[PDB]
């Protein structure tokens, strides 16, 4: 009966940002102030709505996207931004209606000597469209010389590992991010706040 936000925010494993996760939320009651009442979040920013107003709204579906990035990239998880993440990994639309929530996960996602399991896309021939996802691993070709499937001078594997170490500066520490997007359709509204 309650929307399963605990399973999203409290998941044991989080995806790499290039292969970001998405859960569809529907047919449930969502207590958002449950979320924003917690001081646990270093970012909790909504666009086109208020945290409180949400409990008084309804929606066709809610999507919860989630992934890990660097602290200093959290600012790219926002409408209108550019940079490696916004351009090549996870792109919100200019008119994003939703909330972006994040928290430092250095204690779970860093490892002595480096956690290299979290990856990002470093090279892409064009920028992602909003909510587009690219998990391909084709060699990226700079300049004119075909790669023919081989890494080399002008040919690079397109994903690079963050390699998080507990001792990084905070800007380079891992953050877990959840993006909530609120879908209004010409169809039945199945996700509502406790005020409706």
């Amino acid at each position, epitope marked *: 009966n309650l929307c399963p936000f605990g399973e999203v925010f409290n998941a044991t494993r989080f995806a790499s940002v290039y292969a970001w996760n998405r859960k569809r939320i529907s047919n449930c009651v969502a207590d958002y102030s449950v979320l924003y009442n917690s001081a646990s979040f270093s970012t909790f920013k909504c666009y086109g709505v208020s945290p409180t107003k949400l409990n008084d709204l309804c929606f066709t579906n809610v999507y919860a996207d989630s992934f890990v990035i660097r602290g*200093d990239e959290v600012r790219q998880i926002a409408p209108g931004q*550019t*940079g*490696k993440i916004a*351009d090549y990994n996870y792109k919100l639309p200019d008119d994003f209606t939703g909330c972006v929530i994040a928290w430092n996960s250095n204690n779970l996602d860093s490892k002595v000597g480096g956690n290299y399991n979290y990856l990002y896309r*470093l*090279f892409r*021939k*064009s920028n992602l469209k909003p909510f587009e996802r690219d998990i391909s691993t084709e060699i990226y070709q*700079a*300049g*004119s*010389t075909p790669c023919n499937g081989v890494e*080399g*001078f*002008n040919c*690079y594997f397109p994903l*690079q590992s963050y390699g998080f170490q507990p001792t990084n500066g905070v*800007g380079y520490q891992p953050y877990r991010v959840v993006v909530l997007s609120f879908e209004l359709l010409h169809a039945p509204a199945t996700v509502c706040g406790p005020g409706s």
Partner: antibody
Amino acid sequence: EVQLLESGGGLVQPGGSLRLSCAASGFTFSRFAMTWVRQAPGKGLEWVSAISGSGGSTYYADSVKGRFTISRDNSKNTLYLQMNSLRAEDTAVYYCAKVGWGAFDIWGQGTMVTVSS
Amino acid sequence: SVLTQPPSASGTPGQSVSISCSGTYSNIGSNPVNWYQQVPGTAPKLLIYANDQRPSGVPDRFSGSKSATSAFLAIGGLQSEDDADYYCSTWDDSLPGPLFGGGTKLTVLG
């Protein structure tokens, strides 16, 4: 701890030849493409030539094609540039650099080549 | 064909500056951009790769950004020791090796 130590520059007359060397240490040389970039006095940077980690693929700017040959000796961590048919306009500081993620991430401090009569 | 940079830039100590690099869809628009710093008398040093990534040891007051056909290097907290020629570089779909812009001489005004 990475070092790229160049040598072999000097003064030659037009039509002469020179062989530059770049001695690499402090990284896994054979895993990286390597490149030469030159800079004429008071001018900008010009990519010259590059070579794959194994040495089995080489790349050249049009300005030096047919005159310069890049090679490497992975048993000695040494990168070479053989320069034949030298012209006044090849006068420059020649840098070797390691290639990393589409960029030149470590550069030697250069060796000066003067082509003059 | 060519990457174009303004020949000079300046700011006063502790302020910011932005250095631009203009090209075309077939180079800057399609390929990762790098930035290099060359203090006179020394070799170029990589500041920015893959448009906006810093190698280890480059402080976060250097940052890179890119528009459709232009790239930009921003330098905050200017110091005198930032006096140098700054070069953008990228690849072009028609050439085997990278291009460099003509360089921008930065002077922190004294």
